[PDB]
Design a protein around this motif. Structure first.
Motif: not given
Length: 114
Positions: A25-26, A76-79, A94-102, A104-113
């Motif tokens: 997944q890199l 978190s995705k939706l469709g 849009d950073p919110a487009f990674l694998g389901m792992a991160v 889902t794990l982060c769910g609706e949690v924000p990020l800053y990298y």
């Protein structure tokens, strides 16, 4: 399927904290507390350094972070994507487009990298 995970890309940073390492997944996402901010880390295929080094970068400072109100979903995705929305001028990301792992794990949690 808890009895048998049989899932690769499994990494462990600590007893209280778990780190998800994805070679294919890199992508990477470290979840500190049960409901805290998340972080993203990119790694090459022939690269992928040691985990010990990564942790040092995270513990090097105060990962303790908290968002308020930012554009687009947190992680978190939706469709929805290829629709009418053009996406404003040709700029941004849009950073919110990674694998389901991160995602889902982060769910609706924000990020800053970090």
């Amino acid at each position: 399927g808890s009895e048998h995970l049989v899932t690769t890309a499994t990494f462990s940073i600590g007893s209280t904290g778990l780190v998800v390492y994805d070679y294919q997944q890199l992508l990477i996402a470290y979840i500190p507390a049960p409901g805290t901010c998340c972080y993203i880390m990119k790694i090459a295929p022939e690269s992928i350094p040691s985990l010990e080094a990564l942790t040092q970068k995270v513990h090097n400072f105060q990962m303790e972070c908290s968002l308020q109100a930012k554009p687009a979903v947190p992680t978190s995705k939706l469709g929805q994507a290829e629709g009418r929305d053009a996406g404003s001028a040709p700029s941004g990301g849009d950073p919110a487009f990674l694998g389901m792992a991160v995602s889902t794990l982060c769910g609706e949690v924000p990020l800053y990298y970090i």
